Design a protein around this ligand. Structure first.
Ligand code: 6U4
Ligand code: NA
Ligand code: NA
Length: 156
């Protein structure tokens, strides 16, 4: 039995495009990802997701809808990442680059899967179909999946 830490992940998904953020600095830079980070004490998971979206992309939203939950395990790390996945389509400002993140729109026939986390190829298609899901992925390093499960669910 392992302990888990709570994280959020936010996909700004509009009818023809998705907003992703490229990690600019540190280890892992170069990869495109949704926006998010660790949930803080006292805030709801949804409010943590809204906060990270604002801090990381500049976008504010009044509300997000929860679309999935994914547990990530990394070889050599005993703590699991419990990632709660949310989707916007409703935004009211422009994305802003920082020293840490560069946000960019991609058309939905140009989703940059090869430069995203490898798990995204599996669960993103469900998100695009407006389906909900639970997933688990075990990684060796940043690129190699050793085991995974993915299921569509009616309720997250
Ligand atoms: N395999 C994966 N697939 C994916 O789509 N997103 C992943 C992922 N692994 C991690 N992430 C996302 C989840 C979360 O949004 C982010 C990881 O959170 P961070 O470590 O950036 O959190 P914080 O910015 O709160 O951390 P601090 O450095 O403590 O401030 O990256
Ligand atoms: Na944070
Ligand atoms: Na983050």
């Amino acid at each position: 039995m392992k302990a888990s830490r709570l994280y959020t992940l936010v996909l700004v998904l509009q009818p023809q495009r998705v907003l992703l953020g490229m990690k600019k600095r540190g280890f892992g830079a170069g990869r495109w990802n949704g926006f998010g980070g660790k949930v803080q004490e006292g805030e709801t998971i949804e409010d943590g997701a809204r906060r990270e979206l604002q801090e990381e992309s500049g976008l504010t939203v009044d509300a997000l809808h929860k679309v999935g939950q994914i547990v990530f395990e990394f070889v050599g790390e005993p703590e699991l990442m419990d990632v709660h996945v949310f989707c916007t389509d409703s935004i009211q400002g422009t994305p802003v680059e920082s020293d840490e993140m560069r946000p960019c729109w991609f058309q939905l026939d140009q989703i940059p899967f090869k430069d995203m986390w490898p798990d995204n190829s599996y669960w993103f298609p469900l998100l695009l179909q407006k389906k909900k899901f639970h997933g688990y992925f075990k990684f060796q390093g940043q690129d190699t999946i050793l085991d995974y499960t993915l299921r569509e669910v009616d309720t997250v």
